[PDB]
Ligand binder design. Structure first.
Ligand SMILES: [Ca+2]
Ligand SMILES: [Ca+2]
Ligand SMILES: [Ca+2]
Ligand SMILES: [Ca+2]
Length: 243
């Protein structure tokens, strides 16, 4: 079965966990379980068309995915959690920054978040590989996979993604809330210098950047995830919770 949103309820301090483009809640589930062990509630929404056949992404848009993130914040509030940190991986880190401008958060965590909308190379190739792997997961024979990929047209989706990222980069200077910026030094999906851009251009009064030298882009599931989780916990413990 494909992943679904999760909601791990513990104490009154809550974390909204946002996944990346073509990702899903499985990329943040271990972080959610760690946060639960430490007493924090977490909710991980999923973007429209994700955890589903890749054509559903082509029929959706980043505009909807950001609304899915906002809906996740609003779901936490409806469920009784008013004090929320937003933590996002990759595109979700961009959405975490933008969400902080649209909803009241106690803090922001960005994890390998890109700055700017370059899609040529790694993002484009990653999306095609995601689609090919999904069709093999569907049990399709090789001729069917090959022919469907000949007709898979990601250009409009990647253009929308690029424009959404460009817009968020121009909003970074509006960010005010406490922030932890996390980045893998050896990221082969985005420019790791994005992390310096975020750190230097937010207007937050409380900021920290952490680099990890042995992790790849999906840092929440890779070889240093335990240290990443501990660094997130120490950030959360430093914030202005009412309880
Ligand atoms: Ca409830
Ligand atoms: Ca600006
Ligand atoms: Ca300032
Ligand atoms: Ca701090």
């Amino acid at each position: 079965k494909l992943p679904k949103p999760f909601f791990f309820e513990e104490g009154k301090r809550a974390v909204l966990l946002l996944h990346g483009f073509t990702g899903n809640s499985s990329d943040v589930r271990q972080l959610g379980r760690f946060l639960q062990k430490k007493g924090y509630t977490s909710y991980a929404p999923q973007y429209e068309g994700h955890a589903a056949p890749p054509d559903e992404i082509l029929k959706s848009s980043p505009f909807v995915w950001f609304k899915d993130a906002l809906d996740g914040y609003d779901y936490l509030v409806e469920q009784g959690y008013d004090e929320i940190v937003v933590a996002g991986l990759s595109l979700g880190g961009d959405f975490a920054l933008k969400l902080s401008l649209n909803r009241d958060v106690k803090g922001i965590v960005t994890m390998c978040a890109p700055m700017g909308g370059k899609t040529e190379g790694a993002i484009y190739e990653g999306f095609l590989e995601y689609a090919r792997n999904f069709k093999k997961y569907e049990g399709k024979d090789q001729e069917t996979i090959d022919n469907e990929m000949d007709h898979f047209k990601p250009t409009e989706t990647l253009k929308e993604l690029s424009e959404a990222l460009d817009t968020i980069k121009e909003q970074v200077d509006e960010v005010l809330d406490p922030i932890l910026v996390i980045q893998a030094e050896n990221d082969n999906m985005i420019d790791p210098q994005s992390a310096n851009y975020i750190y230097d251009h937010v207007d937050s009064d409380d900021k920290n950047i952490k680099w990890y030298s042995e992790s790849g882009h999906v840092i929440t599931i890779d070889k240093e995830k335990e240290q990443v989780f501990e660094d997130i916990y120490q950030f959360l413990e430093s914030l202005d919770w009412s309880e």
